[PDB]
């Protein structure tokens, strides 16, 4: 009944296309939620897509100026993976920052809403509010924007409070059936940890997070589920995964400290280890969220000064718009598969022919077989779409 | 299988955000029902949201003059909590006055419709009409407009028939599987009882109602399930919960009688006791249904002179529009949690920019943990919304 994730990691030679919602394309005719910060999380039967709605549809007067991340009307929308966020979509909680879990018995939703100085994180398990916690740093309390991990009924969530470049307090919360049973502060060599892409690595949980002040290498949070001990580091690959970043020739990583290379901003991304190698995804553009590529770096999880790419895949063409990406794990017959989603942001602050900001997603799953090439962009033409 | 609500009440330090439907904001683009008088009730698995529809969507020629309370086209809509009342919403009965019950086995719906002076109350259990009763005072027969409470298969509903400005005939109906097994005339010191917010206080049921005749203090109805005994009083707290009312300096309560302080009108509200203290919600504005606050009055359930407030939360900002509010109880793992909803009325007779009257809902649930501040209003811009 409680998911433990004790199976090994599936052998991955790459990723195969899994899902695509065409949300913006369907918005032109039809009522589709305005969403951002999506993620995918699966119960032991089927996968679900989540997103932070803006309390409006796209062909709506209220979709004007929907670029802001924190409004009182943002709610966590939840459909089956594949079903676009139509008007029948269930918004499961109030949140401008969210994280969702299925422990094998019920869904856990971590939902943060309220004032910036005074934010509340509500913990909803099996459809009921079981616990709530207030901001500890009295700043913008934020969480992963992706799936959290549960092992033996204990779910772990990374929550950050403070400024993304000033002092920020990151805590790991251990939640059992919606109740916060333990809270451990972040310890280790990583300092700015945000929007962690966490995945189960039995007997623990490993998170690859986003650094917003100093590093273009991604921080790593290792969580021992038994002892509740936290270890922090960075990804060792010389090909860093954060945007902005430096070229592949001029970039560097340290993987015990930030690389201090164009690290003053970031984007949510993912990476997972394959022995000494690392599978990672990033934008093709080093400065903007344009395009998306995945590849495997040889000894990129253990040795810095490694820039040996292999098995590169283009998920989104370099000319097309990408956004947040994250990892989610699907239990298989005999192993744990790693899958990822890419958020395809369309709209304001980069495309000024419309007044709204929204996204679609494309989902890829790890495969042991063969695959071809392609590109799966959003595909909506904003010049003809309602403004 | 039958719900007995035998668990104690959960320790409540306040309330955390639970749900927000954004109905009016989604109405601007998309087909959303025009509703009023909503409430929340939960089966042992999920929470559902109910509302009295007006037989029309908002972007509709029939949304004109939806400020009328009783029309032949009003039906009780029933969706999962979070799913907005879209066109796929099920209307479970014809009703301009409603109350819904889940006894642990099936849903009970008490639906009142027909002529104002010859109204019919239908009792629908497990999708069947089991019983029916006619208005006994030949005036507007009305009911709680919130969830009713079932203990051990016996559901109790409070029904009133009579005048809103004078003495009315209030009856308590004991219903078993849709069948009225007993009808008790209201007994006690409460003089006018209307729109009761009832919660299970095992072994009985406690209802906090509105006095529309002569009091701004809320009447209490105590119902013994085992004995079918009825006891009536008033919420003793000097900080009265009804609207209209006097200011916090001049408000008073008698704890046995109406306070005769701006008691000629009222709004549906809620209150529950925590030992000698009372947790109550009310509009921030004394005369209008603007804003919503929840707080705890120290010794407010026993002392008619206590005005000691604590644990105040702002649910809806002072300048924003509130409406009906009511209580609903959720069984947890070890106790019974108290949750409340607030109706966010928008439209006519207060906002003349539109021809329709409708509402949104925001839901909060009791919590033993910590929480911050915030405000969650309807948020629709009626100047740009279709009329």
């Amino acid at each position, epitope marked *: 009944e409680y998911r433990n994730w004790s199976k090994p990691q599936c052998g991955i030679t790459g990723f195969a296309p899994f899902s695509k919602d065409n949300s913006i394309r369907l918005s032109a005719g039809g009522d589709i939620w305005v969403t951002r910060e999506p993620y995918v999380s699966c119960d032991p039967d089927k996968c679900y897509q989540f997103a932070l709605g803006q309390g409006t549809t796209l062909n709506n007067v209220h979709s004007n100026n929907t670029v802001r991340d924190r409004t009182p009307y943002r709610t966590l929308l939840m459909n089956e993976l594949g079903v676009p966020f139509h008007l029948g979509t269930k918004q499961v909680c109030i949140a401008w920052s969210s994280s969702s879990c299925h422990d094998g018995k019920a869904w856990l939703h971590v939902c943060i809403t309220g004032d*910036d100085k*005074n934010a509340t994180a509500s913990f909803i398990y099996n459809g009921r509010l079981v616990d709530s916690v207030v901001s500890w740093s009295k700043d913008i309390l934020r969480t992963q924007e992706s799936e959290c991990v549960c092992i033996n009924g204990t779910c772990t969530v990374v929550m950050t409070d403070g400024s993304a470049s000033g002092k920020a307090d990151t805590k790991i919360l251990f939640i059992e059936e919606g109740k916060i049973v333990h809270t451990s502060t972040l310890s280790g060599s990583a300092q700015h940890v945000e929007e962690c892409s966490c995945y189960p690595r039995y007997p623990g949980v490993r998170c690859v997070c986003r650094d917003n002040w100093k590093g273009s290498n991604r921080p790593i949070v290792d969580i021992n589920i038994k002892d509740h001990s936290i270890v922090s580091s960075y990804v060792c690959s010389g090909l860093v995964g954060d945007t902005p970043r430096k070229n592949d020739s001029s970039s560097s990583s340290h993987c015990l400290d930030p690389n201090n290379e164009e690290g003053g901003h970031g984007v949510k991304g993912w990476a997972f280890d394959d022995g000494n190698d690392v599978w990672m995804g990033r934008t093709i553009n080093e400065t903007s969220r344009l395009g998306y590529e995945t590849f495997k770096v040889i000894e990129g999880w253990s040795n810095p000064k490694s820039k040996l790419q292999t098995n590169r895949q283009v998920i989104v063409d370099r000319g097309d718009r990408s956004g*947040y990406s994250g990892i989610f794990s699907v239990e298989g017959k005999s192993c744990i598969n790693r899958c990822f989603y890419v958020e395809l942001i369309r709209g304001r602050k980069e495309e000024t022919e419309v007044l709204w900001t929204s996204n679609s997603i494309v989902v890829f799953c790890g495969t042991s077989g063969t695959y071809g090439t392609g590109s799966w962009p959003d595909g909506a033409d904003l010049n003809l779409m309602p403004i | 299988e039958y719900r007995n609500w035998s668990k104690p009440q959960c320790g409540i330090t306040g309330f955390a955000p639970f749900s927000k439907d954004n109905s009016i904001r989604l109405s601007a683009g998309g087909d959303i029902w025009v509703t009023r008088e909503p409430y929340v009730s939960c089966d042992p698995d999920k929470c559902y949201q109910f509302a009295l529809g007006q037989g029309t969507t908002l972007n509709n020629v029939h949304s004109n003059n939806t400020v009328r309370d009783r029309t032949p086209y009003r039906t009780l809509l029933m969706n999962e909590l979070g799913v907005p009342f879209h066109l796929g919403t099920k209307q479970v009965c014809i009703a301009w006055s409603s109350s819904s019950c889940h006894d642990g086995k099936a849903w009970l719906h008490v639906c009142i419709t027909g002529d104002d002076k010859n109204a019919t109350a239908s009792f629908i259990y497990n999708g069947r009409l089991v019983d029916s009763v006619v208005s006994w005072s030949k005036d507007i027969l009305r009911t709680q407009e919130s969830e009713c409470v079932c203990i051990n298969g016996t559901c109790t509903v409070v029904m009133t028939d009579g005048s809103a400005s004078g003495k009315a005939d209030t009856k308590i109906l004991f219903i078993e599987e849709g069948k009225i097994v007993h009808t008790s005339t209201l007994s006690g010191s409460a003089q006018h009882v209307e729109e009761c917010s009832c919660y299970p206080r095992y072994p009985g049921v406690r209802c906090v109602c509105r006095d529309n005749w002569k009091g701004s203090n809320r009447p209490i109805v105590d119902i013994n399930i085992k004995d079918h005994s009825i006891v009536s009083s008033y919420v003793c707290s000097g900080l009265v919960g009804d609207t209209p009312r006097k200011n916090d300096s001049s408000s008073s309560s008698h704890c046995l009688d109406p306070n005769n302080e701006e008691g000629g009108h009222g709004v549906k509200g809620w209150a529950f006791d925590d030992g000698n203290d009372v947790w109550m919600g009310r509009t921030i504005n004394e005369t209008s249904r603007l804003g919503y606050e929840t707080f705890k009055v120290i010794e407010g359930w026993s002392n008619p002179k206590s005005k000691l407030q604590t644990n105040r939360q702002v649910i809806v900002d002072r300048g924003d529009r509130s409406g009906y509010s009511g209580i609903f109880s959720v069984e947890g793992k070890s106790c019974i949690n108290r949750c409340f909803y607030v109706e966010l009325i928008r439209g006519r007779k207060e906002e003349t920019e539109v021809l329709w009257t409708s509402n949104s809902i925001v839901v909060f649930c009791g919590t033993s943990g910590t929480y911050g501040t915030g405000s969650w209003p309807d948020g629709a811009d009626l100047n740009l919304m279709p009329i």
Partner: antibody
Framework: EVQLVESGGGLVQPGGSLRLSCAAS????????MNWVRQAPGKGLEWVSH????????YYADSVKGRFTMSRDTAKNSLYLQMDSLTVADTAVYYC????????????????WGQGTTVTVSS | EVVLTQSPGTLSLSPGERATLSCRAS???????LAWYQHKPGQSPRLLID???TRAIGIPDRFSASGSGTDFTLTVSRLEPEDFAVYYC????????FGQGTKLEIK
């Protein structure tokens, strides 16, 4: 619709005190950064002070540091600039400006401005 | 200690030419936290360009801006009698600083 209205400007004696107030109409102070910007007569815009949506004062102009106190009260949705020991280099039109900090995108430009209030320090 | 230097001063054109407004930073900003404002006399300053490249909501399509590093440019493609005002470039990253401004005159 959103609006910013300042008040409290007027003649002040050099070495005196004045409290400027700016009120918000449509939006909420709990999610926006707020700023004070002054324009000296015959000079360009100067950023006086900046307060976060969390209530912390990130920035003070070097000239006004130690003399100007900027605060807010989210209950009344009002912004305050307590000016102390005013000199002749403080007479200017004072603007309360609003910009946003995005969790994802960081800071944005100051898109909402008030009408402006005039402070005159003479003799 | 960035010093936002607006290269053109008291520039004069005609209703329909192209305006080239320059803003030079003493040192590399390190981010896109460069904004342009329009300040007509007797009116509140109006945000035109945010992020050194993004036009604000409701700003006419004529206003466009570009640049990075130290040099940032604002260009009005076709002048109109409304577009004659004082233009400021602001660095809303650390350290906060405004530009001295540049005014458009009628010829």
């Amino acid at each position: 619709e959103v609006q910013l209205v300042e008040s409290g400007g007027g003649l002040v004696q050099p070495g005196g005190s004045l409290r400027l107030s700016c009120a918000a109409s449509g939006f909420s102070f709990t999610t926006y950064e707020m700023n004070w910007v002054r324009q000296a007569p015959g000079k360009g815009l100067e950023w006086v002070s900046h307060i976060s949506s969390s209530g912390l004062v990130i920035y003070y102009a070097d000239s006004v540091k130690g003399r100007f106190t900027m605060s807010r009260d989210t209950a009344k949705n009002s912004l305050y600039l307590q000016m102390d020991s005013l000199t002749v280099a403080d007479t200017a039109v004072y603007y309360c400006a609003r910009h946003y900090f995005d969790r994802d995108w960081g800071y944005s430009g100051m898109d909402l401005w008030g009408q402006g209030t005039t402070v005159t320090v003479s003799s | 200690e960035v010093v936002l230097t607006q290269s053109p001063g008291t520039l004069s054109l005609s209703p329909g030419e192209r305006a080239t407004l320059s803003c030079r930073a003493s040192q590399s900003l390190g981010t896109n936290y460069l904004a342009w404002y329009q300040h007509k006399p007797g009116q509140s300053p109006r945000l035109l360009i945010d992020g050194a490249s993004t036009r604000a909501i409701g700003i006419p399509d004529r206003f466009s801006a570009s640049g990075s590093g130290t040099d940032f440019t604002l260009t009005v493609s076709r002048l109109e009698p409304e577009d004659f005002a004082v233009y400021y470039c602001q660095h809303y990253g650390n350290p906060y600083t405004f530009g001295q401004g540049t005014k458009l005159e009628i010829k």
